[PDB]
Structures are given as C-alpha cells and as structure tokens.
Design a protein around this ligand. Sequence first.
Ligand SMILES: Nc1ncnc2c1cnn2CC1CCNCC1
Length: 458
Amino acid sequence: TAIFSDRYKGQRVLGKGSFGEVILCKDKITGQECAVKVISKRQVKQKTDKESLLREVQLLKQLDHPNIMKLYEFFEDKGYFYLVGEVYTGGELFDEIISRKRFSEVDAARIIRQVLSGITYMHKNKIVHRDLKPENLLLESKSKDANIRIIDFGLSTHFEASKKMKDKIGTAYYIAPEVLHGTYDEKCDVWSTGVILYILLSGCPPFNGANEYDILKKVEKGKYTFELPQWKKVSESAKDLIRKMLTYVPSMRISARDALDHEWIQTYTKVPSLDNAILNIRQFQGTQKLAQAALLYMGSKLTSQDETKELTAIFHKMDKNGDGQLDRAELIEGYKELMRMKGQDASMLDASAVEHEVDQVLDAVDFDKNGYIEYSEFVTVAMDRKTLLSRERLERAFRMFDSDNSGKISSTELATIFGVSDVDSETWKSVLSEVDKNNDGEVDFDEFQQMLLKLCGN
Ligand SMILES: Nc1ncnc2c1cnn2CC1CCNCC1
C-alpha cells in the first residue's frame, strides 16, 4: 500500500518507450534520480495474472549485470504501473554510432559482446526479452567508454504489445520467425541480436520490404543474403556467426553463451573502417526517426482535437454563473478533471504537477494568477503548448533527414517514409496530389506538415 507520488516527483520527460512514457523522477527524501516507466492500464493489457507479475518483478529487482538495466521499485494503482529504475544518459546506441568518423568490426564486436553478455546472464535466469531492438540498447553515459544497457528485459511476457503503428516502428525487422507463429523460447533473442549484427556491419536490415507486412513476410521465409558490395569488406567469421544466429530452427540456432565463444567475438574483442555501413546506418536512422515523428505528430493533433473540446466542456459546466470567468483553483480543478477522464499525460503524476502546468500557461497568457481568468483563452494556450511542442519535434526530424540541406523531400523518399509509417500508398499519393499541384515530385517542410494534417482528418 505504498504510493508512487508519496516518494517520487517528476522532473522532466525522458521519452517514449514500449508500453509507456518514461519520466525522469527524483526521490523526495534521498534526491536519487530514477527513470520511471509509466504503463497505462487502459492502453496496455496484461498477459499474466497478478501473482505472476509480482514474482517476476521481485526476481528482476535482485538481478544485476553491467549490460542490463537496473530495476529498483515497482508500484501499482487503479490506472497505472510504475517501473522505477536507473537513469542512463548516453542515448541510443545507433545515434552514437552515426556520430563517428570510423567504425570497424572491432567496434561492432565489442558492442555485440556486451549485448550477448547481458542476454546470456538473463537466459541463465529464465528471462526472455523477445522485443530486442536498437532502441532498447542505451549507452550508460556520454563517455566514449560507456557500457550498453539493455532495457525492458522480461516485460513483454506480462504486457501485450500495441497494435498501433506509432508504437511499432522498427519492431518487424528484429522479431524472430517463431515469435510470429507462437512457439518461441530464449533463442528468439539470439535471432534479434543477429539482425542487429547484420545491420552494424552492412547498414541495411537483412529482412526488408515496402511496408510492415512485407517485412514480416521476409522474416517468416527467413532467407537473407551476403551479396551486397559492403559485405566484401567483412570477415568470413563475422558472416559465420551471423549465419548461426539467423538459423531458422531455434533448436539448431546458436545459444547466447556459445556466441560469446565464437571465433569472431574472440578475435575482434581481443582493421579497416566500414565507411559504407556508417553511411547506410545514418540514412536508416534518419528514415526511422522521421516516420516515428510523423506518426507522433499525427497522434498529438488527434489528442489535441479530443482534449480541447473536452476541457472547454469541463469548464463550461464548471462556470455555473455563465460569464466565462474562472479562477486559478477552478482552472486547476478542471485540468485535473481532464486527467481523470483521459489519463494520457504521464508527466501530470499528482496534483502538484498540474498546479505547475496551470501556472506555466497563465504566465504565458499574460493574465494575473490571483484574479479571475477567461477560460476560453486558457484552453487555447494550454493545448498549443503540446501542439507547438510536437510541431517542433517533427521539424527537427525533417531537418535531420534532409542531410543535403536541400529543403525538400523527394517523392521516392516519401514512399520510403510512408512505407515505414505504414500509410497506404494510394492514400498519401492522393494527399500529395492535393497539395503538390505543380508536379514538383517533392515537398518542403510546410507541405509535408500539410500532408500529415490531411492524413489525420484535417
Ligand atoms: N533507463 C532509462 N534512462 C533514460 N531514458 C530511458 C530509460 C528507459 N527508457 N528511456 C527513454 C528513452 C527514450 C528514447 N528512446 C530510448 C529510451
């Protein structure tokens, strides 16, 4: 019967993970910083019963390995689960790798040794990941010597994954064929690691396609090749390990522990730079992140349409006198009422968070916080703070993808982006034709924003 907000306060948002938002939190007594993953019961269903979840959490809190995220505490209330663990500040592995001048098999081997080391340890404890992918590999700190920390190990056994595409970007490339068909075991993690290793050394997914289902069809057939030009740079032993890890029948697939003893791991963690692989990983990364940002922008526009009208109706009802005037305490009460009905905002953990947010909106609008305020003006501002925020995230991702600083995305590139985003081919072309009436075969940022608004009913 211990409450999460009695102990921890939210400092800021760390980002979106599988199953929920991750908030940087701080212990109110000790000052300890923690990364808290907040899982919404309404958004995410459980796969196991109460007893199985508690026992797994209890085990996970005791486990310790340098390549595995450390879990500290678990909480639960009427609407949420709170997974409290150690903060890591190095960011995603692949974002660090694209910022390097050089990258060799020695670097790749040291990365994969770390991932294999962590996996081996968790397998010894009968914990399977299943959803292992580059976004679940965080560097512990910004130091060039930083260890990789694998996150979300063991979670997918207890929670059902989202079917929504905004939560599924990247996932199809890395999933083992046996997970698609239902009978899987710890060997599925060695497959996913094999896919990651294939991409580290070549910069392209082994199983690819024009959309999610085309990727899944390729994974399911299990056929891949080492026939690209950049594979001629690579040692035969690297390709031998990859073959063992991407073996189709799991009983015949190499174990994590035996992969650590493989000739390639032994030789290269004891050579030329892969310039072409770095080039492809940077493009891969930019493409994946812009599709994510596009889907998140479309989502936040829909969330805004929903919340704006809801908040107006909450205040209209609150305004018993009917003159449009409410005070700060009434605005706070109504904003808290919005959080009860929705439960979308992870950063509004308690009453004290919403009070700060109300004050931030009031200080922006230039209205006095100790008198009565026009609520319609408050609603417009409060929602634009989420609307403009998501608008800037999209733009940054547009600039990053546009590595030539051309200012434009070509029609070929839009097909790639919307393929990863799983927006129907005929559907976006229609939206493009509606906005691109000069047959340029390309769009600038504003035109791209306009397409996305049209692809979420606006
Ligand atoms: N333990 C963590 N430390 C810092 N950030 C974290 C975690 C766990 N999740 N997150 C959020 C990031 C957000 C960007 N994508 C990778 C995960």
